[PDB]
Amino acid sequence: DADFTRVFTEEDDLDLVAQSLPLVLKVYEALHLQNPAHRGLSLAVGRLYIMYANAFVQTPAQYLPEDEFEAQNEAYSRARKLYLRGARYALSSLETAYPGFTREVFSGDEQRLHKVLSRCTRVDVGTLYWVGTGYVAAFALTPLGSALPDTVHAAVMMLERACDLWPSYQEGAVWNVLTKFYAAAPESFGGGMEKAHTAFEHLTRYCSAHDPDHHITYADALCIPLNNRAGFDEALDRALAIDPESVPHNKLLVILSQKRARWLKAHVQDFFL
Template sequence: MKNKIIFMLLLLVSLIFSSCSIKKMAYNSAANALAPLPEKKVKPDTDAPNPVTALTGEEDAELVGEVFPIILKLYEGMHIANPSHRGLAIMTGELYIMYSNVFVEGPANYLSDDEYDKKDKAFLRAKKFYKRGYNKILSALNTAYPGFTEAVNSDNAENIEKMLKKCKPYDTEALHWAGAGILAAFSLDPLDIQSLQVLQGAVLMLEKVCSLDPAYSGGATWEILAKFYASAPESLGGNIEKAEKAYKKALELSEGKNPSIYVTYALSFCVPKQDSKGFDEAIEKAMAINPESDPNNKLVIGISQKYAGWLKENKDMFILGE
């Protein structure tokens, strides 16, 4: 499968740098097919075969990690060749954020304190990719709504909300990933002035997603907000009541099939309260989920359960006095 994917990607790359008008037409068709404009996307038929499951349904994370950079760079190359294509900008940004989360920040979380330099270097690299990702998505939103990026960077709630009123339901994907990328970068380096400046914009974008499409991505946006509300100081928008409501909404929408939500509860709710019993229960619930209950998302389930297992083995690093 890997060789076939690489062959397809190389073929598409050859189209990108071709000057032939026929090939340009083929390239544009490929761009629209691989990264449709938000307003052109149709609601997927849940019963129809989806080639994306070749990645999301793969339980071997190492295999996905080998091919992921190739796919990412394909999209980025296509975007460079057509910088005004919003679909390519959004997809490239999403891929950078996914790659950073799963294959850069994720593995770094397992490093011990004795490997601080290596861990810090990985986190800085992850932050760089998060920024690269959300800036590409913001550029697409700015193309659709001139002044969008300036508003988000203004740290002015009134300006941001005014701009967000222009967004349509089909913008939820871009808003979700841009907001997720910003919060991820901020969590790795809260003292970064640039991340701090766009923090309010990120939260408002995510809240807009919940307004436009409350069930988006099975509660993924609610989970991100739950983490933020639970961990951020009140001066930056933290609120434990809002965190609990967001967590319950995420849990409801996930239908109990996503171990990540239980991991979030253990880390964001139980650790601050040093709730040992709650921590154990959440981790056990995460590990008890059968990957076959959601075969199209085996990759995420496997990664989350691996982390849950590590948290169980290293509980004394999070719950003191055990």
């Protein structure tokens, strides 16, 4: 890894990536099952799955016509499954480092949950982000029940925990996932808008001005449910204003977000009165 993923993050041709990744997922996955105790591999393959599920499965399904919705439901079910697989691969990195961990956190006993999480150091922050984000993404592809799956609450605790150890991690990547969650979940669920705007301010602290993500996250997660059409447009505009050729890294993630912003701009009618 390291030098190898570079030829993906820096790529602006999406189909090259879409067609080449599946065998890379398959290869990392294989290596993992061979050396299960190797934590880096564990996280790598988990993160890969989570990332692929988002860009090459869930995302494409969002651009689907509304009458084809059966296909789109299949897609979402597919992405859900993949997010989960990723989360577990990453979770194994934790379980390798802190045996019993999976048992404790997912028990959903508030005393056991928070107890095993205290065991975590900045080393593990990377793993926490991905396990959390994996489960959180899957949750979003699930219908809405009474109360909250214990896994997702555990997930959100893992994220808040990485936040304690390392608020600046990945330019506030964790804050962005939380903002999106808090905004969506009811306060019965542990979310709410006050909680979400708060998490977003923190994003702004550590995030890059050359990153389109927070702008989108703002329009999508906050502006829409608050029926603010102005900020929505303005934010999406700020995102589409970034030259992908001027950005040091993740040219790919930029192209992808800008694709999504354009679609949002065009579908502005569906989110507002």
